Each structure stands twice: as C-alpha cells, then as structure tokens.
C-alpha cells in the first residue's frame, strides 16, 4: 500500500498517544515503547513491528541506537503528522544527514 500524504490520519482509533501506548504491551524490543508511541507509532504484535497512525508507515527490525522520529522521516517523509511535530527543516536535516551517511 502507498502511504498517507494527507492532513487525514489512516487510522483516527490510534491518534491518541494513550491508545497507542496500549498496543505493545509487555515490550523485549531495543527501541523504548514510550519513544515509539511519541513519535506516532503503535505495535502490530509482530515482533517489534510499528506502524504510524497517521501515514500507515511500517518499520521493522529496531536497532538499539535508532530514533523513532529519525526512522519515521527517513522512510516516511510525505507523513503530515511528522511534518507537524517536527518541522520541514528538521525533515531536511534528517534526510541531508541519511544521504550523506551513506555516500560517505
Ligand atoms: C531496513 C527495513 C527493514 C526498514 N527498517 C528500518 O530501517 C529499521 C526501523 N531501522 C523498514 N522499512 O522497516
Ligand atoms: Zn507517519
């Protein structure tokens, strides 16, 4: 499926950070549950499996130095959710910084 470049969340059941916290329960994974459900992501239940109320962006495979809000710009930059949180200027770094992390 595409993702979400609208203003619209996917999924309104998980806008709330509270909703989204509820989804992961007891969690193993490298990457802080409270860091995840901030940066708009809740569990799937498949290991640690996230996806994003608002673009229906999913991430697998957690390292244990990763950012949420870092990941969610690098695979999920049209997200209108991290565009309000964050900022395009913050979104531009991010992405200056993956680009030129891997030409390097
Ligand atoms: C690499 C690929 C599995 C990717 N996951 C990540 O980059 C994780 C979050 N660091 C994804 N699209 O799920
Ligand atoms: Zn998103």
Same mark, same amino acid.
């Given at each position: &499926?595409?993702? &979400? =470049? *609208?203003?619209?969340?996917? &999924?309104?059941?998980? +806008? ?6 509820? *989804?992961?329960? *007891?969690?193993?994974? =490298? %990457? ?6 901030? +940066? /708009?992501?809740?569990?799937? /239940?498949?290991? @640690? #499996? %996230?996806? !994003?109320?608002? !673009? ?6 957690? #390292?244990? =130095?990763? @950012?949420?809000?870092?990941?969610? +710009?690098?695979?999920?930059?049209? !997200? ?5 949180? #964050?900022?395009?200027?913050?979104? &531009?770094?991010?992405?200056? *910084?993956? =680009?030129?992390?891997? !030409?390097?």
């Amino acid at each position: &499926n595409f993702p &979400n =470049s *609208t203003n619209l969340p996917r &999924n309104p059941s998980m +806008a709330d950070y509270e909703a989204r916290i509820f *989804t992961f329960g *007891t969690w193993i994974y =490298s %990457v802080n549950k409270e860091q995840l459900a901030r +940066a /708009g992501f809740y569990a799937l /239940g498949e290991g @640690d #499996k %996230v996806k !994003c109320f608002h !673009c229906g962006g999913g991430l697998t495979d957690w #390292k244990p =130095s990763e @950012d949420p809000w870092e990941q969610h +710009a690098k695979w999920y930059p049209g !997200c209108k959710y991290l565009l309000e949180q #964050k900022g395009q200027e913050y979104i &531009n770094n991010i992405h200056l *910084t993956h =680009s030129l992390e891997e !030409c390097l």
